[PDB]
Design an enzyme around this catalytic site. Structure first.
Site, PDB file in Angstrom:
ATOM      1  N   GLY A   4      -7.691 -36.925 -27.641  1.00  0.00           N
ATOM      2  CA  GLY A   4      -6.390 -36.420 -28.044  1.00  0.00           C
ATOM      3  C   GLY A   4      -6.446 -34.962 -28.467  1.00  0.00           C
ATOM      4  O   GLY A   4      -7.437 -34.298 -28.217  1.00  0.00           O
ATOM      5  N   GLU A   5      -5.373 -34.485 -29.112  1.00  0.00           N
ATOM      6  CA  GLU A   5      -5.166 -33.063 -29.345  1.00  0.00           C
ATOM      7  C   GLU A   5      -4.486 -32.904 -30.698  1.00  0.00           C
ATOM      8  O   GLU A   5      -3.412 -33.468 -30.908  1.00  0.00           O
ATOM      9  CB  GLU A   5      -4.312 -32.413 -28.251  1.00  0.00           C
ATOM     10  CG  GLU A   5      -4.550 -32.986 -26.857  1.00  0.00           C
ATOM     11  CD  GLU A   5      -4.283 -32.047 -25.697  1.00  0.00           C
ATOM     12  OE1 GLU A   5      -3.896 -30.896 -26.001  1.00  0.00           O
ATOM     13  OE2 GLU A   5      -4.472 -32.456 -24.518  1.00  0.00           O
ATOM     14  N   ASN A  26      -3.728 -38.187 -39.153  1.00  0.00           N
ATOM     15  CA  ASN A  26      -4.758 -37.281 -39.661  1.00  0.00           C
ATOM     16  C   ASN A  26      -5.761 -37.984 -40.586  1.00  0.00           C
ATOM     17  O   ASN A  26      -6.573 -37.339 -41.233  1.00  0.00           O
ATOM     18  CB  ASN A  26      -4.147 -36.044 -40.321  1.00  0.00           C
ATOM     19  CG  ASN A  26      -3.433 -35.161 -39.303  1.00  0.00           C
ATOM     20  OD1 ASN A  26      -3.596 -35.338 -38.081  1.00  0.00           O
ATOM     21  ND2 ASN A  26      -2.608 -34.223 -39.757  1.00  0.00           N
ATOM     22  N   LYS A  60      -0.709 -37.362 -42.877  1.00  0.00           N
ATOM     23  CA  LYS A  60       0.027 -38.363 -42.131  1.00  0.00           C
ATOM     24  C   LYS A  60      -0.982 -39.316 -41.491  1.00  0.00           C
ATOM     25  O   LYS A  60      -2.154 -38.979 -41.346  1.00  0.00           O
ATOM     26  CB  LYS A  60       0.955 -37.700 -41.116  1.00  0.00           C
ATOM     27  CG  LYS A  60       0.265 -36.628 -40.296  1.00  0.00           C
ATOM     28  CD  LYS A  60       1.216 -36.113 -39.222  1.00  0.00           C
ATOM     29  CE  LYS A  60       0.480 -35.291 -38.204  1.00  0.00           C
ATOM     30  NZ  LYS A  60       1.355 -34.882 -37.114  1.00  0.00           N
ATOM     31  N   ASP A 118      -0.783 -31.619 -44.459  1.00  0.00           N
ATOM     32  CA  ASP A 118      -0.416 -32.326 -43.244  1.00  0.00           C
ATOM     33  C   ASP A 118      -0.950 -33.756 -43.310  1.00  0.00           C
ATOM     34  O   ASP A 118      -1.488 -34.279 -42.336  1.00  0.00           O
ATOM     35  CB  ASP A 118      -0.825 -31.561 -41.991  1.00  0.00           C
ATOM     36  CG  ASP A 118      -0.186 -32.009 -40.680  1.00  0.00           C
ATOM     37  OD1 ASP A 118       0.969 -32.557 -40.725  1.00  0.00           O
ATOM     38  OD2 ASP A 118      -0.876 -31.854 -39.616  1.00  0.00           O
ATOM     39  N   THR A 174      -3.423 -30.161 -34.131  1.00  0.00           N
ATOM     40  CA  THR A 174      -2.535 -29.009 -34.285  1.00  0.00           C
ATOM     41  C   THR A 174      -2.998 -27.834 -33.399  1.00  0.00           C
ATOM     42  O   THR A 174      -2.207 -26.959 -33.053  1.00  0.00           O
ATOM     43  CB  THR A 174      -2.256 -28.672 -35.765  1.00  0.00           C
ATOM     44  OG1 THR A 174      -3.425 -28.846 -36.567  1.00  0.00           O
ATOM     45  CG2 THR A 174      -1.142 -29.511 -36.379  1.00  0.00           C
ATOM     46  N   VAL A 198      -8.504 -29.354 -28.382  1.00  0.00           N
ATOM     47  CA  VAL A 198      -8.473 -30.644 -27.703  1.00  0.00           C
ATOM     48  C   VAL A 198      -9.798 -31.357 -27.982  1.00  0.00           C
ATOM     49  O   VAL A 198     -10.829 -30.704 -28.103  1.00  0.00           O
ATOM     50  CB  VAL A 198      -8.152 -30.497 -26.206  1.00  0.00           C
ATOM     51  CG1 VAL A 198      -8.244 -31.838 -25.484  1.00  0.00           C
ATOM     52  CG2 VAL A 198      -6.803 -29.834 -25.984  1.00  0.00           C
ATOM     53  N   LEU A 251     -15.362 -40.856 -35.939  1.00  0.00           N
ATOM     54  CA  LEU A 251     -14.776 -42.010 -36.592  1.00  0.00           C
ATOM     55  C   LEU A 251     -13.976 -42.771 -35.556  1.00  0.00           C
ATOM     56  O   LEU A 251     -13.376 -42.161 -34.682  1.00  0.00           O
ATOM     57  CB  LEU A 251     -13.964 -41.520 -37.774  1.00  0.00           C
ATOM     58  CG  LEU A 251     -14.837 -40.877 -38.854  1.00  0.00           C
ATOM     59  CD1 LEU A 251     -14.094 -39.952 -39.761  1.00  0.00           C
ATOM     60  CD2 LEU A 251     -15.562 -41.919 -39.663  1.00  0.00           C
TER      61      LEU A 251
HETATM   62  N1  LIG Z   1     -12.079 -39.600 -33.812  1.00  0.00           N
HETATM   63  C1  LIG Z   1     -12.423 -38.561 -34.532  1.00  0.00           C
HETATM   64  C2  LIG Z   1     -11.672 -37.383 -34.537  1.00  0.00           C
HETATM   65  C3  LIG Z   1     -12.108 -36.345 -35.346  1.00  0.00           C
HETATM   66  I1  LIG Z   1     -11.020 -34.541 -35.400  1.00  0.00           I
HETATM   67  C4  LIG Z   1     -13.250 -36.478 -36.129  1.00  0.00           C
HETATM   68  C5  LIG Z   1     -13.883 -37.678 -36.080  1.00  0.00           C
HETATM   69  N2  LIG Z   1     -13.487 -38.705 -35.308  1.00  0.00           N
END
Ligand SMILES: Nc1cc(I)ccn1
Ligand SMILES: Nc1cc(I)ccn1
Ligand SMILES: Nc1cc(I)ccn1
EC number: 2.7.11.22
Lengths: 262, 297
Positions: free
Chosen positions: B12-13, B133, B130, B128, B15, B18, B84
């Site tokens: 995903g993307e 995030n 939400k 931010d 603020t 990417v 994560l």
């Molecule tokens: N899925 C994710 C996204 C980010 I930014 C950091 C860690 N895991």
């Protein structure tokens, strides 16, 4: 109220104290720079003050820029012809960090009279980022000043401008101000501003906050007194001019005191 | 540079940039990579990135996404993050039928507050908060992420960017156009998130700023000088606002016990100055029995 973050002022203060040690430039860096001098640096900072007024930048931006510069020059030899390039890039970065509406890069190029290309500015930006390792959130004299103001009762705008004013004067002269931590300079500027306008000294409540006494502030306060006294005679004037305006209560025009009680 | 990273998939993307899940080919570590393009002939490194990187380098806490590295090229920046499993919004949506167990909710709120208190203790507003995030793993942890809209603040606070916080999580002080806001705005978001974890529907899902205020007032009672001193002197306050009575938290969040409801109200106090701190919130009786269960993934 919440704008003074009462549940956090103490932890924040403690954190900034630790952090201003981390972001401290090397005291003796100028002797290790074959081609640049304290004199040249003064010209640079003085120019950044002008730039800061032409673009209506936060004072905090100016302080950040100077921290960036001194730390960069603590790590990298720089030739005289590139000193301004480092300064433009630091100003650019400080603006991006601190300002709601930073000036565009183009404006940073314009202010160097096209000494440097846009590409030089951008490349220097990246080099500066690499050398500081993106550790840009540096405690400034102002961050300590604003917190010390809270200890006033009531607030006095003349004491607040004047301390800001003395703080900025310190940015100019690496000798002697590179030896003092932001928090020490801020305290010495706040004591000296308080004493000049009110008569009152550094309060007990700030002794309790900072651990700084008028004893431990003695060396820095003497240099700042000297600087304040000699200000109208400094080669660099942009700060005195800046602090003539009603905006800052014209504090620069106040005759400094002649002695302290020491 | 990125020789040791093998891309696995897009995830995903934010603020800005990417985001990809990747694998360290040498150590076996799974990471998220945030690719930020550098405007090398025009604007250089985005201020978004300068703030995110600089603030995350300082913020080392178990409930804040860990930034492992920053890998430079002349043309790109890659931020390397611990990986994560997913974000809280995806978790909620997945839990739309089954619901989220109350102990997990309580655990997550407790962790969110620990992360946030750390931010505020280190003079950083997130701005931010939400579900999108907030990142969870398989072991029951949750972490603040996406510090692109974050800001290192001074004491006292000064005027910062007004266009901040996703609408639904935006505090009434920002809505009503106040000159100054502080740590309180983050607590409001978490309040909204607390409620959302309990119901899995957004608390205040507005279509517009005026609609946003109406949603807040209709549920918490229209504020007055009694509840919120200085509210009627607020820039965008309108004398004409309908006067709704406060909705009981029995209706608002039925599943929630008396302790949860008390904590929630304190999080959604209108007055920023009375809004509870994350620090104080950590002590609230709601968390007496807090545990760390593992989610059902
Ligand atoms: N899925 C994710 C996204 C980010 I930014 C950091 C860690 N895991
Ligand atoms: N060059 C790259 C880019 C990604 I995203 C992952 C691995 N290698
Ligand atoms: N969201 C709402 C609710 C009412 I009743 C009136 C206007 N807007």
């Amino acid at each position: 109220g919440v704008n003074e973050v009462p549940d956090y002022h103490e932890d924040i203060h403690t954190y900034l104290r630790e952090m201003e040690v981390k972001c401290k430039p090397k005291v003796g860096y100028m002797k290790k720079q074959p081609d640049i001098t304290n004199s040249m640096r003064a010209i640079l900072v003085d120019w950044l003050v002008e730039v800061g007024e032409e673009y209506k930048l936060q004072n905090e931006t100016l302080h950040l820029a100077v921290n960036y510069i001194d730390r960069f020059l603590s790590s990298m030899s720089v030739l005289r012809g590139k000193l301004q390039l480092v300064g433009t890039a630091a100003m650019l970065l400080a603006s991006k960090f601190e300002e709601i509406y930073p000036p565009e890069v183009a404006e940073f190029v314009y202010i160097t009279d096209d000494t440097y290309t846009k590409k030089q500015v951008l490349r220097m930006e990246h080099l500066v980022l690499k050398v500081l390792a993106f550790d840009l959130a540096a405690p400034t004299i102002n961050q300590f000043l604003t917190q010390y103001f809270l200890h006033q009762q009531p607030a006095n705008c003349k004491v607040e401008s004047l301390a800001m004013f003395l703080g900025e004067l310190s940015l100019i002269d690496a000798d002697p101000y590179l030896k003092y931590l932001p928090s020490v300079i801020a305290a010495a500027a706040f004591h000296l501003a308080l004493y000049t306008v009110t008569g009152q000294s550094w309060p007990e409540s700030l002794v309790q906050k900072t651990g700084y006494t008028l004893e431990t502030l003695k060396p820095c306060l003497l240099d700042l007194h000297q600087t304040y006294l000699r200000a109208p005679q400094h080669a660099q004037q942009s700060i005195r001019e800046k602090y003539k305006n009603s905006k800052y209560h014209g504090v620069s025009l106040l005759n400094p005191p002649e002695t302290l009680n020491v | 540079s990125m020789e040791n990273f093998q891309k696995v998939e897009k995830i995903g993307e934010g603020t800005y940039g990417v985001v990809y899940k990747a694998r360290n080919k040498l150590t076996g570590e799974v990471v998220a990579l945030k690719k930020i393009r550098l405007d090398t002939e025009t604007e250089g490194v985005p201020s978004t990135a300068i703030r995110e990187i600089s603030l995350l380098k300082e913020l080392n806490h178990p409930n804040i996404v860990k930034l492992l590295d920053v890998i430079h090229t002349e043309n790109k920046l890659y931020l390397v993050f611990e990986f994560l499993h997913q974000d809280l919004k995806k978790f909620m949506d997945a839990s739309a039928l089954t619901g989220i167990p109350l102990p997990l909710i309580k655990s997550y709120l407790f962790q969110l507050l620990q992360g946030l208190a750390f931010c505020h203790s280190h003079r950083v507003l997130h701005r931010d908060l939400k579900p999108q995030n907030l990142l969870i793993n398989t072991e029951g942890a949750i972490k603040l992420a996406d510090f692109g809209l974050a800001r290192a603040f001074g004491v006292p606070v000064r005027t910062y960017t007004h266009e901040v916080v996703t609408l639904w999580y935006r505090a009434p002080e920002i809505l009503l156009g106040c000159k100054y806001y502080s740590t309180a705005v983050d607590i409001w978001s978490l309040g909204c998130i607390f409620a959302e974890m309990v119901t899995r529907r957004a608390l205040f899902p507005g279509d517009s700023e005026i609609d946003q205020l109406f949603r807040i007032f209709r549920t918490l009672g229209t504020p007055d000088e009694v509840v919120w001193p200085g509210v009627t002197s607020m820039p965008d306050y309108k004398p004409s606002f309908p006067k709704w009575a406060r909705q009981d938290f029995s209706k608002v969040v039925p599943p929630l016990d008396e302790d949860g409801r008390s904590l929630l109200s304190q999080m959604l106090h209108y007055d920023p100055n009375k809004r509870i701190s994350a620090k104080a919130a950590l002590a609230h009786p709601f968390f007496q029995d807090v545990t760390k269960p593992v989610p059902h993934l």
